[PDB]
Design a protein around this ligand. Structure first.
Ligand code: FAD
Ligand code: FAD
Ligand code: CL
Ligand code: CL
Lengths: 431, 431
């Protein structure tokens, strides 16, 4: 008889996890609270390291990804560039070469769409908002209770339900701050301008490439989208106030509100905000930084993705971390499957618990480092000393650490992680 | 603008190669000359390394393997064992730990069948015997001519058609000795005995494990099969004569003809031969050792597996070498796919030949090493010195060479191979 996994959350991580597990013969169910709506129309990007992890999960995942972007005489290397956004000199500060297809970009909604088609029919169950978890003995199934009154029974439970995970609250208690994200005291304006507008304000070289503009207490990212016809703007600013608890995290705002935060910045950069639509959006940045999980797993329950370790997005790699989680969880559960197949139910459930323990041992340090790292690079992008031209040497000193932190993300040794995870699983089984 | 590959040969390698290609969105047709499966009931085993290569091609391949094969306590480890077959001492000479799941064994025909159920329908076409290949210009399609008089047109062709490959013939000329395999001047008697008979001749220990009995000019290997209820016997002997081809490479033989080759050997081994059926099989062992391929590929045509490098089976890993080929070719053609999206037909075809050119560069040394190493280790098994009580001191030193040559097979750095293949491909493309 087989092994069943209930994944709470039908986001990118939970769906990628499902693909990896089913392709190995594991019985999977994905329970998604939402009706069946895709993600936001925004773009996202994956490191070549995450794409290779996708491949190892199921090569159809990478096909889904590449059929969900656009079509790019020699081959283009991907570059991150930083520019001085506060002085009209707007000189280029720093550049990181990511190599050929160092990043591969897609539409979130289009990728999640292609992924669900890759899955066999009957994996994803929508309007299934989890509300309680009923654990029993290790040897017994776990019961998930949903808001619509239905129930489901699975051998083990993975929380892939995002920044406001319900599986997390069950683990730590609804009133513990560890069950919840908190504000990072920054929020973002987001919106589009046309390429001719972008060209007009920044010049063609800056307009056609991804560039981050540093300055004091704020920073702004822009990159072309929709085959170099549009440019996406993301403008992050500092907010000393608390975010009202049940106030939504996304909200409406005006280009004039954004322009005010940047009034002292150089002309081209203010023009870019001036070219946005009159109405734009305001995104509050919450994460798990103040109260990181003490453990990603307990018994036969495991957290993954933003549920385990949601981050502010200043590395553009938070889902990459989640894809590592999926690859690790998938390889471990596969090893449970093959190594206990002819054994009693006692051994099979012990092995699940040993696998989830191993997952926590090998993943928590890197993921929680990454959450911290994401806040740290924002602080470097927003040094007060960017304002002071006499403090330029200090301000620009930051880029070596940004380099180190990027390379630690991009050059992750996932083969060693998998090897370590298997060894810890066998050790945990008394082997 | 989708890339189509024609695979000639629906054996283990051609199908595995098709599974990896289709999972990546490449259009594949497999042309198989037979009308059903073959090698009905034969067993084979893959190294853990080869199983990891399968997983990177498509994890469903590994699931297929594991549903085509085989109580508490702990996890078994896999041992190659060698025993003195000549003298009456018959003492354990050497052993080699391959670890947990160091080999994974299955039934050939049942594995191939499971593999075919993994592919989408219509990929494999039976009763398609490649007769002739028509190459036109690099920017045109390769035309395949089948014996039933139909034709197929593909962007490129992969020869996965075995030891007597039609594609190889086309590459080197049907009159070249390079286009044909040749006799290794050894052949094998194969047959089964009952496990009860096996025990009373070798003892319980040896009967229930895989052992190779060495000696002068011959050797014998055995292992349990069909739930440890029978034992498979393969006795390899030397043949000074030529194998007058048109003489079928398989043929019937008698138990006593086998026994006559082992008359001087110790009693336990002779008892094993006597316990076989009166009628058994004779298998001539051909390979590509004498006239190894000058190249595995040319233009838009590539050889994989036995077509490229058929070996005598004294490492028991010939297919594992082929799975490496399939991994390496699959990753290259996928790199051709993404890297030439949107380019002109001319560039796409140049990319194909550049990839095949890179495949030849990275594989031909290891593959042809492994053909040599297969004959080499067989010689060490059949040293005339085994019989001489004066030269058994130097005869027993072969085992370090056995260990190194095995480890070189088992610990293949396929990730280095993949990396080197992409780099060579880019080099071949002018970047
Ligand atoms: C502006 C921004 C840009 C970003 N850009 C990148 C990038 O370029 N590259 C990158 O790698 N990462 C990026 N990230 C991070 C990335 O988006 C997240 O890491 C990723 O979306 C997390 O995926 P997830 O599946 O864990 O969580 P989610 O995407 O939040 O999915 C969680 C799912 O679980 C459902 N759910 C929630 N509660 C329940 C419940 N009780 N019951 C059932 N279902 C429930 C939810 O409805 C949701 O669908 C960015 C983040 C932001 C804010
Ligand atoms: C006794 C023995 C035991 C072995 N045990 C092992 C083991 O345990 N583990 C391991 O890794 N390796 C083992 N090997 C090696 C392994 O079997 C081979 O290397 C493997 O079969 C090669 O697979 P292939 O698909 O390339 O060739 P094949 O298995 O020979 O298949 C080639 C296919 O191409 C078809 N074909 C041929 N010509 C044409 C044509 N003109 N047109 C269309 N189709 C054509 C054939 O019908 C066939 O289906 C063993 C070999 C032998 C002889
Ligand atoms: Cl992010
Ligand atoms: Cl072999």
């Amino acid at each position: 008889q087989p092994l069943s996994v209930g994944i709470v959350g039908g986001g990118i991580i939970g769906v990628i996890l499902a693909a990896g597990l089913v392709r190995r013969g594991i019985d999977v169910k994905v329970f998604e609270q939402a009706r069946g709506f895709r993600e936001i129309g925004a773009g996202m990007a994956f490191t070549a390291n995450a794409v290779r992890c996708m491949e190892m999960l199921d090569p159809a995942i990478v096909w889904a990804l590449r059929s969900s972007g656009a079509v790019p005489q020699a081959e283009a290397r991907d570059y991150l560039r930083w520019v001085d956004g506060y002085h009209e000199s707007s000189k280029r500060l720093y550049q990181l070469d990511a190599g050929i297809r160092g990043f591969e970009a897609c539409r979130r909604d289009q990728f999640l769409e292609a992924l669900v088609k890759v899955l066999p029919e009957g994996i994803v169950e929508c309007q299934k908002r989890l509300q309680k978890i009923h654990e029993k003995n290790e040897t017994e199934k776990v019961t998930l209770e949903f808001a619509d009154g239905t129930f489901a029974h699975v051998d083990c439970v993975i929380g892939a339900d995002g920044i406001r995970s319900r599986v997390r609250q069950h683990l730590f208690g609804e009133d513990s701050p560890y069950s919840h994200p908190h504000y990072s005291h920054k929020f973002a304006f987001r919106g589009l301008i046309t390429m001719e507008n972008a060209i007009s304000a920044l010049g063609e070289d800056k307009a056609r490439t991804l560039n981050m503009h540093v300055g004091p207490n704020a920073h702004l990212i822009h990159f072309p989208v929709a085959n170099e016809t549009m440019v996406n703007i993301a403008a992050f600013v500092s907010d000393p106030e608390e975010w009202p608890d049940k106030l939504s995290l996304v909200g409406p705002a005006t280009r004039e509100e954004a322009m005010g935060y940047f009034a002292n910045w150089n002309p081209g950069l203010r023009a870019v905000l001036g070219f946005m639509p009159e109405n734009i959006d305001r995104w509050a940045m919450f994460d798990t930084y103040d109260y990181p999980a003490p453990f990603f797993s307990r018994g036969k329950i495991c957290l993954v993705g933003d549920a385990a370790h949601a981050a502010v997005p200043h590395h553009g790699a938070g889902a990459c971390i989640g894809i590592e989680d999926a690859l690790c969880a998938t390889v471990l559960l596969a090893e449970v499957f093959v190594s206990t197949r002819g054994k009693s139910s006692i051994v099979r459930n012990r092995a699940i618990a040993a696998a989830f323990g191993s997952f926590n041992a090998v993943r928590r340090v890197r993921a929680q480092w990454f959450v911290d790292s994401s806040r740290r690079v924002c602080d470097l992008y927003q040094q007060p000393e960017w304002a002071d031209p006499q403090k330029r040497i200090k301000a620009e000193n930051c880029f070596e650490e940004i380099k180190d932190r990027s390379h630690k993300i991009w050059h992750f040794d996932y083969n060693s992680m998998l090897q370590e995870a298997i060894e810890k699983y066998r050790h945990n089984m008394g082997s």
